[PDB]
Amino acid sequence: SHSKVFIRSAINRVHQNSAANGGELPRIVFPEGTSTKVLKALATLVEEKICQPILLGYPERVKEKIKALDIPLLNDVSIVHPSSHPKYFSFVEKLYSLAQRKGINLGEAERLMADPNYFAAMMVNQGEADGMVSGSSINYADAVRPILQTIGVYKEGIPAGLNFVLLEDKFLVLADTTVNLNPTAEQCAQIALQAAKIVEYFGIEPRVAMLSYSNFSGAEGTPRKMKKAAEIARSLRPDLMIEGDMQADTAVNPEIMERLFPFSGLKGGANVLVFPNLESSNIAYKLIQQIGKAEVIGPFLTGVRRSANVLQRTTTVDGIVNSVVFTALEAQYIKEVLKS
Amino acid sequence: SKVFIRSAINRVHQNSAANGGELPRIVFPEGTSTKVLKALATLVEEKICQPILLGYPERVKEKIKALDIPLLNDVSIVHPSSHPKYFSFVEKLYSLAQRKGINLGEAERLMADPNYFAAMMVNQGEADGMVSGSSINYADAVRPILQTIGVYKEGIPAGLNFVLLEDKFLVLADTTVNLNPTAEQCAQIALQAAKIVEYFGIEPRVAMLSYSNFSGAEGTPRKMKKAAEIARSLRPDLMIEGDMQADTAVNPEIMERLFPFSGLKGGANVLVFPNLESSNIAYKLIQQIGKAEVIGPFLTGVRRSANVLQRTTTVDGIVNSVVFTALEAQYIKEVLKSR
Amino acid sequence: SKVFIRSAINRVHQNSAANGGELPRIVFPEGTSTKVLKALATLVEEKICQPILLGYPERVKEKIKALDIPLLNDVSIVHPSSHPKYFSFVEKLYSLAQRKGINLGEAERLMADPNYFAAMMVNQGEADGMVSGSSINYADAVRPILQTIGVYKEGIPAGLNFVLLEDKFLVLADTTVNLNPTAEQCAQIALQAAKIVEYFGIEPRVAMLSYSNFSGAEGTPRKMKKAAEIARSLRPDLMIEGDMQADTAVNPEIMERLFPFSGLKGGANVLVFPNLESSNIAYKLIQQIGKAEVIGPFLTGVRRSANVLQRTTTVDGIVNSVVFTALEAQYIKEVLKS
Amino acid sequence: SKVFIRSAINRVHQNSAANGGELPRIVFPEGTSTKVLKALATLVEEKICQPILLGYPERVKEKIKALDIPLLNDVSIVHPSSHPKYFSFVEKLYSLAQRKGINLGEAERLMADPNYFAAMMVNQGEADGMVSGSSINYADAVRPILQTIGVYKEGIPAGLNFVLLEDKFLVLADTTVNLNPTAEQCAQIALQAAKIVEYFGIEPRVAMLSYSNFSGAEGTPRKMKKAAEIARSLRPDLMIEGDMQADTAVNPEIMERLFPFSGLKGGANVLVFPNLESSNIAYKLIQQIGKAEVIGPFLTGVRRSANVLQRTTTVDGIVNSVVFTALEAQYIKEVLKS
Amino acid sequence: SKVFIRSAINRVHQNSAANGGELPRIVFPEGTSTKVLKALATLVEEKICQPILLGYPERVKEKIKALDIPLLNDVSIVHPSSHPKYFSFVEKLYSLAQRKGINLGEAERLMADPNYFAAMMVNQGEADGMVSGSSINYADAVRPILQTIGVYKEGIPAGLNFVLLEDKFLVLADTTVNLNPTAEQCAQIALQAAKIVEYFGIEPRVAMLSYSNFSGAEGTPRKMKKAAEIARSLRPDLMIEGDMQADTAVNPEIMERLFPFSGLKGGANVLVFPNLESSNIAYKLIQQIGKAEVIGPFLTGVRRSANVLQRTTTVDGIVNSVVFTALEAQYIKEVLKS
Amino acid sequence: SKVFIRSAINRVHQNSAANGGELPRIVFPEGTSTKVLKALATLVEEKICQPILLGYPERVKEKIKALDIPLLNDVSIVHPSSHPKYFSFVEKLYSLAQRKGINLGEAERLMADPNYFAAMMVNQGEADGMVSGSSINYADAVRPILQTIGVYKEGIPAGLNFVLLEDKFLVLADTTVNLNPTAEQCAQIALQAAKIVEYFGIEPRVAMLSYSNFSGAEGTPRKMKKAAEIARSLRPDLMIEGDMQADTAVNPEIMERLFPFSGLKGGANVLVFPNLESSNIAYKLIQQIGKAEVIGPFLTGVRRSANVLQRTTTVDGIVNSVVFTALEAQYIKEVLKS
């Protein structure tokens, strides 16, 4: 429901983006070419003109799965078997060149590149595709490792998972929900900056709360970390309301903030929630998703040079469609930045 | 929904009768707190407790009259340093604390503070429970409680919150006290939370929460797996499992589909957290977004009934907390008699 | 002896006469303290300060009449939460402390406490100095001072004591604040102690104390040797030496006979200690054992004049402390005029 | 004052008599030390010990003749590597040290050093005690003693000093060995200190010193509070208390007024320190500026009588130390008589 | 020496003839490895094992025909995911690892990897041993072995190498697995090495290596000294000694002359190293610049026979490794039957 | 092998002949060492050095005559405390060490030790080099050298050994001094070793050794990879590479076959080790079992020529070390020639 208004606006922005670009739709690689949930989601995704899907796998292995489920319009969609691809040898040498001083010999560089996750990441890095969506079948750290060492982070960026909580008026952004165990104050500032750019993309004023178990205490440990993170972010972005350390209800509820901490620079409630450690971010978004009545979409991987998202291992068919939509949007956004 | 609260009110009444009809004496240090006084208006209607307010009687009565709350006339009001037992209370605090850096003059100043006086009242049986912390931060409110009442043997002070869903309630712990509990401490927190769930006639099913599903890797995955193992040792009759993610823990479908080897079936109703950031942020986010009622936090592990309100609380929040403080006071008074 | 304190009292009078007969206003948070009130009887005759007592005017007068001390009939008495500036002080403390875990209601309770009200009075110029801590432990008395008045730039809060010998006085530091100062902190403590000694027209000679004589081994010998080196670079005109034992430091014959290469001749009169255990135990043992007067401790490194009495103090100790707090208030009020 | 010292001198005399009139054989590794020789002049009149001087006989005798001390002209003189027991001593040290990085040639060189030969003489019963360290730093003097004589079981090596006041004496420890004793070690130091006090017929009253009064806060307050608890369980008949400040410990009026719950009444006469900086600085400052005699340091916890003089000692101090070393040798020679 | 290897080959034949002529079933995960196939040409004439190659059948067959190795035309070839036991193996691996972050689908991919399938074949008795790692790094080849076969009681996985000199052979351990073994672990490594030496009818004489000779100083000297002590208590019939330098260890004349108290006479033939850098570099340097043949490494401490070749191995190395893998497989079959 | 040393002997003769007819004065602290004296018989025949033996002249002479070494009846013999420069040497050591815990009496006693006297002779130009340590452990022999002669600018003290194979020679470092050098220190060791290889007109090719091949993992793999990077930036003309395994380092085929991206080709001839266990064990193992001549260790990084023999050395070992000590002394006298 609230997804459906939010995702439909996102789907429209993908269409506005393809149009005024000749009608080019982003090429997205799916390493799990035989995944039932990926293929069923792709039925929706070509119907809706979101992307050209490129599936990885043994072609007949893939096609006979499609006809078993008989979802018709994946009729002609691209299928690539990594080690049969003409660029396989060039991909192997590039991964070897990247990793030969990280304990990776030519044979394992060959074995890694035959794995669809590495092949997909190299395809995106080398411009054979605009994005990838992986991790339907494997755990997050394994799915994200090929992405970080092949595609990597942009300058001063930090890889950080991000989730949207979709409310009646507003949405909230939560980060970092998937990658960093215990980010420093500097890293928390960088995660907040990345989260704010995403909020701005939707034409919304980002209002950033650095979360703690404390309200404006600044005591040793995380209160001080989250207080310092707010300060660093404010110096790197003096136009944004950024505040901390504060408790979560203090952060989201504007009447709580005004009544208890009127000196605070964050008014109107936070829509960006930065967490102090992975336990808190990862448990929070999952508890909201399971017991709250709010739809949470994501996680989405911020901080990487090209568009690449890891599906949470628990996702539904609706999740995958949402994730591809935002992978397409990100690929289009990255493709316009790259020219100017 | 309010059904869980109405059942608790009914139990408080069921408890009074079969004890002559006496109601637990609940002392409130913040005698002039607007939210506390508004909550008690509701709570005297329901015959939950005999409230004792602390403060200067005239200052308290003028506040009650300013708010136009007629039902609090004649409610007991006590000024700590004018009470007959003050000096005896000062002497007991001094004896508890004179080797913790507290001289007699400092013991006198502390006992004139309503939070210490209330905690001493509960400790000495002059009251059956206390509710504080509407106006001061949690650490300041809980220090007199821990220094005066203390924890029972093998207990650990740990805040606990109820999440009330349509079918079902969850308990969250530890939401207020321990920064980074060890595996041994998380196990003790689980047992404490499990006993509370049992009190309501529900089978406790305990999950040790992590950002990981059954990895046992270094750090909190290993800690929460070890916590589950220790918990299983001391109570082999309970479903206790970890390390696992929160959606795995509460959703019986995710568990059976992805981790069928797990000893926890049917979804967890006890969620033990690995550190204070995760526990504290979670219940406040659940409370603010999503439409589930969250009650608490309640201080477990302490020798007598004493609960600290979150500073962000509403008036209904306070009413809920007093109802369960009265239940806890009635239960602890049965234990104290058996002993 | 009596010469040093009487010379100090005279220096307060020279400063007062040179400012139109003004006396420094000194706040005493412990307005009902028996030892504070008895000490003030001595000090009101000598016209060293205008005392301001904090408390409920009646219980303070009730106690003055119990102790049957007539020259305090006219002493000013202030109840913090009744004072006209109370709410502005509360707002000021709230503003400085609202991101240090202090809400407005807690700022109100702290400012009603005499110790915080005294520190704010000194900070805000309603008084020139304060003296506290006869009745509470040192950490509790000094916290409002450090949180409200604070340290001057690059300064460090450090307790200092004078040991009064027939010839000479010694200065001991840091006797009260820092558990385990670094080499950098020990040099800064030496610098603060050195300026106090110069104020009395004495040449400072600084020893960085250890359990070792010029070994420079790992742990405190190396720390005190590095502290001496840091201090010498920040003050190349002063004799500063370490690491050395306490008898080596104070006895010039031991130094010359055993360590002739040393840059410290004639015996040290500034003794900087390696940790709080050694400083605090030393001045207290000296004070109790052997007959040297020990005065202090005096809180150095802070922006305005504020000293905390040791809880074990006598009535004469308080008298000595008020005298030197008055001199400090006068000195800081001359610096502020620039 | 000196009443305490001749009381000890007389106790040595009553001890030699009723035993055969023999005097304890005390070896001095520093046979050519000016301060040692001048001190021994005083001590042979008083018939305190047979000194055995170590060194080359000719070198030692010309020093005695240079200083014009006629009364040392038939003191025994021993050259380690010429002594009949040298080779057997080398091999006992070699067998003990051959897995601690010491080959046979190095055992020969160590045993030719007077400090090691003296420790071996005392260990092997060729002498009753030793006194060393007038000329070298304490750690170098005490290493042969600890490696050769060692500690008795559950003992800990700890320096101890007597502070002699008009009415009473104080005992201070650990003044020389342990940098940062644990609570367990501090309790053991207290037990050793208490028995030394009992030898003089005095009731030991033990204070564990800190910069805090009965706070138990983290770090040394908790350590010294725990040390008192361990000590009280190991000797429930003694007043042992802590953590407390030094003036609290020694002054009975301060203790009673501020801390009446304390189990220590009448003032402490045994002061156990939390670290070596505080102990070492304290006894040295008292000795130099306090106006009481300080004797020691004396090495406790070791199987036989062996004491290391402080490098800063006077001739007079060396005399005091030898007297109590003689008493200790006599006491240990009665215990060995099992 | 090829003299030593030929004795091993004959011992395999004696073991086979004494078990009905059965030869050990040895799995090779690297079924297409050129060096492995070339080695197997040699190993099928010596009748050492029945080889089982893992891989897809024509890839393995196409490779055999490419290299034109006629004797491997009928060697068994197994494609893991087509094997009838595959799903049973997955369920067993899943049950072992499902609380180590391995879901069922991941257990499926792992079991399709030949290294895991080979390890599970050995674990479940479908083969008697395995040889892997010609093509992948050591830690990747050994992880499936450690996770699947595991270590026996109180065992520790540790690589062991034979250095074959004219007179004697030396054993080196741990050459591949443990970065920084504790004294407890180093003693276990010695015990494991000693049993292997006994198997060849030789008396093991064990040296715990260090950069120090019988010093026992902090760090590695103390570690190797305690390791010698632990091993001696766990095996009082063996000469075990340390800490010592490598030339001291191997040269009996150096031992006799410089450390005659040592319990090791005749030179050590078991050399235990203090960390992985020293063990790994030593055996590789001996192999390259000495003129002694070095065989191994062989994985000790594990429940069944599984050896990982060093990636740098030659074809002769693999032949040497399979011979001793065959011997170990035959030995482990007698233990399993008794 | 005999070629490399004879070439070294001849280069000594050309440098001396180019320098009048003088040969370096080499002082030997161990004047009665049997192995030192037997080696000196060989070396004065070879007209390598002007030897100075330290000790009591009669004790040394009867050792020489007892062993019947006729060519030594005219070698210089010096008793340190009888030498004219003794007291000036004591004063120079006192100045160097008086803030490191060494009093004047300790400086006199240390300077009577031949190891300290020899080091002071080399420092003060009374000799051109020294050779010590045949009879005492390495750390005791090298301490006087480091405390007296010291390290040159940005240098690090590091032991170095030559391994002589038929084709070439390898250099190993640091074999004697640093327990666990940082990445920065390993680079400095590489630079020092590289200069020594250059001195013989050979191209230095440097391997930073690990138990890993180009992994860069945490611990020594990352340390040796970073060390190679630091060394390459300070010396961009040299092949410097790591982290790598030892067989990878020396064998150029293994390198080319398995790691062709590597910048070190033709095999390493400079091997820098990650820790003292690995360097020290490797050179001693090679020396005993590798059937290669190993020369050293030689002390690099020090201002003047001073080498410590390993205690396990042979007579031929000593002869080799003295030859290269002479070459080093001659070379250091051309550098001082600016």
Numbering used by the authors:
A (entry chain D): 437 to 776
B (entry chain C): 439 to 777
C (entry chain B), D (entry chain A), E (entry chain E), F (entry chain F): 439 to 776
Per the authors:
Bacterial hybrid malic enzymes (MaeB grouping, multidomain) catalyse the transformation of malate to pyruvate, and are a major contributor to cellular reducing power and carbon flux. Distinct from other malic enzyme subtypes, the hybrid enzymes are regulated by acetyl-CoA, a molecular indicator of the metabolic state of the cell. The larger ME isoforms (hybrid enzymes) are predicted to be a fusion of two unrelated enzymes; a catalytic N-terminal ME subunit and a C-terminal phosphotransacetylase (PTA) domain. The PTA domain is homologous to PTA enzymes (that interconvert acetyl-CoA and phosphate to CoA and acetyl phosphate), yet they appear to lack critical catalytic residues and thus acts as a sensor instead.
An extension from d1 (residues 524–550, forming a loop with two helices that we term the 3′ loop) sits over the 3′-phosphate group, interacting via residues R535 and K538. Using HPLC as a readout, we were able to prevent acetyl-CoA binding by mutating R535 that makes a direct contact to the 3′ phosphate group. Variants R535E and R535A abolished acetyl-CoA binding, and generated an enzyme insensitive to allosteric inhibition by both CoA and acetyl-CoA, although these mutants retained ~70% activity to wild-type (wt) MaeB. We were also able to generate structures for R535E, R535A and N718D PTA domain variants, which demonstrate the same features as the wt PTAapo structure.
